[PDB]
Amino acid sequence: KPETHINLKVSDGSSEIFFKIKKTTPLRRLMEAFAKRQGKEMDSLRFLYDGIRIQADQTPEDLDMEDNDIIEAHREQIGGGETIKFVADGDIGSGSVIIKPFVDMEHPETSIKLEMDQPVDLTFGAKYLLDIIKGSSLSDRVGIRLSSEAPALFQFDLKSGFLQFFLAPKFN
């Protein structure tokens, strides 16, 4: 049969706990478990997997979870909750797409994952981005890593290999 069990960290950054559970168990155990240890109450806490607010009634095969995946615990928010916003302001007007991390389990090649450690706010040159997307031909998905200090990484994966683009952000 398949794996039938997987391990997941659960962290708030100073305190983490690992668990192994069937891929069919509601996460309530782990969320109550982490919560008891924390002193804090079960529902005084916001829980997200890769940017996605999850709720105790949900299973790992639902979120299409990997081995070694992480759930993060935050104090109650706004909210319900992280987002990516792309914006351009030009001469003629302006544009603004907001996308939310989500996982569709029926077909998950489509989903949107987000490890945010620090929030970032960066600008790039659309001429360069326009060439970078020419690698969409190589890969179903694109991986983007953003550093407020280093150039950004845009990665397209092949079967044993990759095409990477490192692009310096603008200043002003």
Next chain:
Amino acid sequence: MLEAKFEEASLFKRIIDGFKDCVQLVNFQCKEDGIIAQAVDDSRVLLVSLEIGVEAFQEYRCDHPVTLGMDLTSLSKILRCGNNTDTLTLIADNTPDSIILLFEDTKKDRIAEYSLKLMDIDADFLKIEELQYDSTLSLPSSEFSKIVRDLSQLSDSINIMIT
């Protein structure tokens, strides 16, 4: 000699197309364990890093480290050659002045062989350094493509904001 054979001629074409648009002359370095390429564009704001492991060729062999410098325009003219379903094989004998691209169709029927004169190209100096990043997201490349293409209409600058 170097001898690297792709299952799909389409793969290599599709990889060159991935970046023939920002850098134009690139040195491909062949090794015992695969091929890599780095190049910076002219503005020197964009670095392109290619790596193809051994598990992407159906058959890979590289006796000695060799470096082939290619004009990516020249190269993609030749990559428009044959059926793009076909077995494409690169071949260079060591200390090379040309590279050979050899298309063959499954049946012994046709066999197109191209030779490309090589370039002399300076290595620049860049090395890369990974460092962790504040944020990491992954999404469909078709979606990101649409976003960029669309917002491209309005400004010369796109800004990303995660919170």
